[PDB]
Structure 1
Amino acid sequence: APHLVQVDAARALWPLRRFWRSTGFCPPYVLSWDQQLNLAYVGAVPHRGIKQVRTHWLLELVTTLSYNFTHLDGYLDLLRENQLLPGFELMGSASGHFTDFEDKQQVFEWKDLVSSLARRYIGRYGLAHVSKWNFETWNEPDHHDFDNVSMTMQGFLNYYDACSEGLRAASPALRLGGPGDSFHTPPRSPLSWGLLRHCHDGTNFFTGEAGVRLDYISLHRKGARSSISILEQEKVVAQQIRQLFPKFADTPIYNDEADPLVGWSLPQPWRADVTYAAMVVKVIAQHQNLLLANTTSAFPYALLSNDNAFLSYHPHPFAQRTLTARFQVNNTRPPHVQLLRKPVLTAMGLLALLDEEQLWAEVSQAGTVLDSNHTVGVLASAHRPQGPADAWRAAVLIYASDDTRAHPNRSVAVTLRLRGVPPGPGLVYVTRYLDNGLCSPDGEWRRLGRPVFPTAEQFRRMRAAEDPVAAAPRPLPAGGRLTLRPALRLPSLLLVHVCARPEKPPGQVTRLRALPLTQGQLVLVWSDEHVGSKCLWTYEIQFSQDYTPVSRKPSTFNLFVFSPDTGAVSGSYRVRALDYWARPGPFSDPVPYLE
């Protein structure tokens, strides 16, 4: 019997925050050509769909009393160039200098280091930007990963107070949290529980005052292939924190490593394709629906980060826990690197269209009501018009997902009954579907016979599977209703996007950049910050050899790899937005390129 999905667009229940807009990684690198492409792909998720890159070992990019910040400056400018913030873990030895946080002098030096860097980047980027940064403790302090740095229980607390007072010395507006570990039952996780105790009741290393600032609590809990299992473990740890530390009852909780499965470099086929994309959406829906949508408990859950900004390696380009799939093409002169957009990364573009208010929705099957702890579920949002640039919008994101298990011999009948759409001008809807058959670059890779060093043409073919199948904007039926009976595969993702015609056309594409890949090939990447509306069919690219349209199937992702048959790519480029009512926005400033 079919899955009934009902959405009521009149009933805008509560706020829907985009709490999931974070990725991260650990260098084994951070300024190679590979990482510049990668963070361009990450930064190109539309509508700031990924905003934070939680990065380990950032203070190994600082060398040594005075410090050389050159390499840090590099990585951070790279993030800034891609409209990305660092999840700034205060993690590193300053290339060998710090060795012992029970050595009182080192504690004082750490504080002065933190003040220096914080004040430096306040200088470089401005305080308003640096105040958005999640400064954090050293990663997983109970997982013994300090290298040649002695970090005892007491030293961790000294370390923390220096982090806190150091940031404060730069500005009180800067945010700090921790410990970023799992919080297992005591006697386990001594440094994690000890930090909370110290902040709640302990004494400041520098000031002697009782209590120490702690702006958020970060944990890590992973699913062991179960999606719901991440939420169950979070609840337990959050309840324990509430009862044991009453002053942290309202302290925001982050799960900044909320991955389906521990071990990023373990090859898993489900990490290659939509199986993973659909599960990441499921996890997020579960979190919104079964934790934040006015539950009796109401824990203060504020951030989920999928730690998947790693670069893949041979012979597992797709099978690793990464947003991109990397190919090091060693047989060109010179060797070059290409990345493809994995479905998981494209899925972050779908999640990005969700707006600021959740709508009422219910999934059922033969009358039995099913919450997000099932294979099929939904997240629906509504947008309140802000100016002439936008109108009302609904985004309805449905998933079919059996966690890490795919079922290719399976179809799932789904009837979507949308009702109560507030009436208005030129109401159109647009579908966007993703599954393994139609949208798996991994799939095409395998149809082509798994080329280890893909040719130009094989890359085009693979890149054809990156975007969702998109139906042209049809108009909305009378009465503000819409019924649809799509068949969904398992896994799959379906985004129904209902939008009203805004008064003005789209705003100007900005910050266009050209990036070389190899002979005859390049990447175009831009920012959608001033486009001012999410109702977008595609981005129209034009090339000039002393302007004509580059013909390509529609795509809202703010990155295009230009690879024409002719190899002709030297000249100038410009890009503009095209909306669901065919209206054009103003062309970006023209970008020049010469191979």
Structure 2
Amino acid sequence: EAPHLVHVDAARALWPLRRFWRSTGFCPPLPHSQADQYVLSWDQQLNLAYVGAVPHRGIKQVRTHWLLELVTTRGSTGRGLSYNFTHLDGYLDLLRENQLLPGFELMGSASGHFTDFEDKQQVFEWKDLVSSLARRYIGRYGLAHVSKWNFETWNEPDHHDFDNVSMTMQGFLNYYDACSEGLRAASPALRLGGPGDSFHTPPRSPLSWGLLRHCHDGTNFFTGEAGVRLDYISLHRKGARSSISILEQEKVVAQQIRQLFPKFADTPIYNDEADPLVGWSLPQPWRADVTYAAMVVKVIAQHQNLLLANTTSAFPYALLSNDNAFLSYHPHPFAQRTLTARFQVNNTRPPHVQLLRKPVLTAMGLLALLDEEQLWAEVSQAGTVLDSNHTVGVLASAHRPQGPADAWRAAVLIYASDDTRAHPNRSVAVTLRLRGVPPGPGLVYVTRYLDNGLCSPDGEWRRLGRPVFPTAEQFRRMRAAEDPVAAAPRPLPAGGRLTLRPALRLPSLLLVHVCARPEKPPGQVTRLRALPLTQGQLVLVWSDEHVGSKCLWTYEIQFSQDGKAYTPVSRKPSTFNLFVFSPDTGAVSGSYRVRALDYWARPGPFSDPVPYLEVP
């Protein structure tokens, strides 16, 4: 078989490249009124630390169901009604602590107070609850912050998961007007969209189409004004194992909306559950490893190249979210649709929890390296040009430099993916010809590579015999496979051109990073935290907000016990903003500090030191 040729032209920055995929989401389990226990548990604290640690704000939003089950009430409609926001504060603070935003679905019953969206008193109360919420979080976080949040309707109104709430077609419309007026009363600057459903062919999905008809033509329950604002339209379409099918289904719904509701011609569209396959909890081997990670990249490449890049349609697609922040269950720690693999290690005194970063999470780190301009690229095989609707594709970006702490970069991400199918004995020959690299000081390139043989913690877990309660040693062995294989910085050839011939597996991901040397070294690591795991172990997590350049080789972690000299912690190169520290001696009490190391072996300054004393 002829090699796949991938040509990238760094002299042709074509149009902006938006990072429209920086979202995840989850649903707490039953009973929903106990969402607080799932959402504020140590598991979730760890889980969100991992979501937030993807570098360069690679994941921004966490679309969370049943947020309003986190609010309780005192009194009643008649004698005076009060809200207790404590558990909601807890969860929202937890997101903020990890630099994440909620996908704020206005979903739940405030501990069973709201039962009927056609009851006029209830609709008026809802409006005030929504204003109270917004005003509260505007005061707690600032208007600039909260006005970044995608407030959204109840999830999947056409799927009837309303617990004991009666939400008719009319009810849903009243509920919507209360949301819209509730938020508007707090501030006209806040964003609301919906309905978050399939938009199946009419007469199906009637609440969804209903909502659009209501906002476009109906009358506001409170003001009586014609038309109600709708800032974005969110749909769900999953691929039933096909990547390109997600896009095909989207184009069909977008077309129907464009024709039926002209006022909505420019209204941004979200697919905020854009998963390969419906049913997060169904174990699938491909969800465990690079198969799913490469498919996630493939789906994003298809959106960028076949939808956003230009088109006849040029339809206003703004967000894609893989709904994958759920926590996994025994006996399927790795094979559920989750960013992390959860191990409830019950045999320690006391029981504890460990998470492993799955390849899909790691791949979000690769997408995070993409910069703000798209470069011209073209994939071909035997002289035939292949668009991203094929097993091999590419996404290539460039960065226009600003300060002395910055310089030109190109990021080239290549995927080899047959959707949900792995091909363990296939090898795909690729010839990458990058040309038109502008001249610049100290031009180097670094490669990062993911496949199932080298970077699958699931694979390592199976090689160890799938231990249900892995040992500390066995966890170390599993984690050694979390990061891509990194190759040390190499100078670019003379002349402006780079050509590589990597052999890709199916699936695999390859990121080729080309950087010119910024004048100044990296910035400081901030917000370092040390969180207990169990006797002998902790997780370090930090922020890269002030680090500056994306041309990072690793973070150097240093440890000092007894005021004694700081000593580097030996480990794989990694740009992930979190590390599980589990030394063989078990010695973890002391101080820690972390700094960025760039592609030219320059350090940024150390974080403030962080004391840690193990409670015995």
TM, length-normalised to structure 2: 0.96
Question: Could you report, residue by residue, the CA deviation over 1:39-81 in whole angstroms, capped at 9, with x for unpaired residues?
Answer: 0000000000000000000000000111000000000000000
Query: What SS does the corresponding residue of 2:611 show, helix, strand or coil?
Result: strand
Secondary structure at the residue paired with 2:521?
Answer: coil
Q: Encode CA deviations 1:425-481: one digit per residue, 9 max, x unaligned.
A: 000000000000000000000111111001110000000000000000000111210
CA distance in 2, matches of 1:40, 1:386: 30
Displacement after TM superposition at 1:548 (Å): 1.1
Tell me, what secondary structure is at the counterpart of 2:72?
coil
- In 2, distance between residues paired with 1:168 and 1:389? 41
Unaligned runs of 5+ in 1: none
Q: Residue 593 of structure 1: CA displacement?
A: 0.6
Q: Distance in 1 between the 2:221 and 2:340 partners?
A: 43
* 8 Å Cα contact 2:483-2:572 kept in structure 1: no
Q: How many residues align?
A: 595
* Residues 1:554 and 2:573 are matched in the alignment: yes
CA distance in 1, matches of 2:60, 2:452: 27
| Structure 2 residue 595 is matched with structure 1 residue 576 | yes
Following TM superposition, by how much is the alpha carbon of 1:493 offset from its aligned partner in structure 2, in angstroms?
0.1
Q: Deviations over 1:89-120 (max 9, x none)?
A: 00000000001111111000000000001000
User: Which whole-Å deviations, capped at 9, do the CAs of 1:385-435 have from their partners, x for residues lacking one?
Assistant: 021111000000000000000000100000000000010000000000000
Secondary structure of the 1:446 match is helix
Local SS of the residue matching 1:473: strand
For residues 117-153 of structure 1, the C-alpha deviation after alignment (integer angstroms, 9 at most, x for no partner) is: 1000000000000000000000000001101111011
> Mapping of 1:193-208 within 5 angstroms?
193-208=209-224
Deviation readout 1:280-322 (Å, 9 max, x if unpaired):
0000000000000011110100000000000000000000000
**1:165 Cα offset (Å):** 0.5
Helix, strand or coil for the counterpart of 2:513? strand
What is the SS of the residue equivalent to 1:205? coil
* Structure 1 position 552, deviation (Å): 1.1
Alpha-carbon distance in 2 for matches of 1:103, 1:330: 48
Distance 1:297 1:387 in 2: 38
Alignment deviations for residues 513-557 of structure 1 (CA, whole Å, 9 cap, x no partner): 000000000000000000011000000001011311111121110
Q: CA deviation at 1:23?
A: 0.2
- Which deviates the most, 543-552 or 566-575? 543-552
Q: Does 1:191 align with 2:210?
A: no
Rounded Cα–Cα distance in structure 2 between residues aligned with 1:129 and 1:485: 45
CA distance in 2 between counterparts of 1:231 and 1:370 reads: 17
Counting aligned pairs with the same residue, the percent is: 100
- Of 441, 455, 477, 1:461 maps to 477
Query: After TM superposition, which residue ranges in structure 1, 4 or more long, deviate above 3 angstroms?
Result: none
- Tell me the secondary structure at the aligned position of residue 455 of structure 2: coil
Residue 264 of structure 1: how far off its partner (Å): 0.3
Residue 253 of structure 1: how far off its partner (Å): 0.2
**2:301 is equivalent to residue 300 of structure 1:** no
Q: Secondary structure at the match of 2:542?
A: strand
Cα separation, 1, equivalents of 2:138 and 2:404: 34
CA offset at residue 27 of structure 1? 0.3
User: Is the partner of 1:338 in helix, strand or coil?
Assistant: strand
For the residues of structure 2 that align with 1:159 and 1:387, how far apart are their CA atoms?
Answer: 48
Aligned to 1:351: 367
Which of 278, 288, 293 is the equivalent residue of 1:272?
288
Alpha-carbon deviations, 1:210-237, whole Å to 9, x = none? 1100000000000000000000000000
Where 2:47 maps in the other structure, the secondary structure is helix
Q: Per the alignment, in what secondary structure is the counterpart of residue 285 of structure 1?
A: helix
Q: C-alpha offsets along residues 238-268 of structure 1, whole Å, 9 cap, x if unaligned?
A: 0000000000000000000000000000000
Distance 2:235 2:176 in 1: 16
**How far, CA to CA, are the matches of 2:496 and 2:178 in structure 1?**
57
Instruction: State the Cα RMSD in Å.
Output: 0.4
The residue number in structure 2 matching 1:46 is 55
